[PDB]
Design a protein around this ligand. Structure first.
Ligand SMILES: *[C@@H]1O[C@H](CO)[C@@H](O[C@@H]2O[C@H](CO)[C@@H](O)[C@H](O)[C@H]2NC(C)=O)[C@H](O)[C@H]1NC(C)=O
Ligand SMILES: *[C@@H]1O[C@H](CO)[C@@H](O)[C@H](O)[C@H]1NC(C)=O
Ligand SMILES: *[C@@H]1O[C@H](CO)[C@@H](O)[C@H](O)[C@H]1NC(C)=O
Lengths: 50, 49, 50
């Protein structure tokens, strides 16, 4: 058993229309930069988060 | 007319090279700590990016 | 009864019971940055609190 909270997720749809991956945008600063760049891959560097 | 003596003169020149670097937190400026305003502002995220 | 600053937001208030003046301060402050070597290479990150 787990309990739901209001969150923002970044969902991924493949070419068949199924959700295959997601990012929880408020777990980590890394996840937050993933959410901002709108990608699952981050290049080397320094990013302002929030 | 031919000069007969000289003078050695030192003068100064001033040049700007750089300016202040700034960053903005878009949600902090527009909404503060209002959750409702942030939920309303979620429609304009591209402009802040 | 209320005090307002230059930005017009309320920053002071008289207490209606004890009649004492109170200052109000926001509790969200300070910039954050994240350093990453690339998601391709690793998931380890560093965080800078400015
Ligand atoms: C060329 O100009 C200099 C000045 O720039 C002359 O030197 C000065 O001479 C006077 C007296 O003749 C002195 O009181 C000054 O102290 C000297 N100045 C320095 C910096 O030493 C020099 O005599 C001139 N030469 C000629 C041939 O006219
Ligand atoms: C998508 O559908 C095609 C055709 O049915 C299938 O071959 C493929 O394996 C499915 N999945 C992906 C990820 O393409
Ligand atoms: C109101 O209640 C507070 C605490 O119960 C008391 O100190 C105060 O004297 C009361 N009256 C006024 C006018 O604040």
């Amino acid at each position: 058993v787990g309990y739901l909270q209001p969150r923002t997720f970044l969902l991924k749809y493949n070419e068949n229309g199924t959700i295959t991956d997601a990012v929880d945008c408020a777990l980590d600063p890394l996840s937050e930069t993933k959410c901002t760049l709108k990608s699952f891959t981050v290049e080397k560097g320094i990013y302002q988060t929030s | 007319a031919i000069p007969t003596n000289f003078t050695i003169s030192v003068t100064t020149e001033i040049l700007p090279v750089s300016m202040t670097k700034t960053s903005v937190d878009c949600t902090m400026y527009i909404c503060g700590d209002s959750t409702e305003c942030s939920n309303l502002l979620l429609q304009y995220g591209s402009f802040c990016t | 009864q209320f005090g307002r600053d230059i930005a017009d937001t309320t920053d002071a208030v008289r207490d209606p019971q004890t009649l004492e003046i109170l200052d109000i301060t926001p509790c969200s402050f300070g910039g954050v940055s994240v350093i990453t070597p690339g998601t391709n290479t690793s998931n380890q990150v560093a965080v800078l609190y400015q």
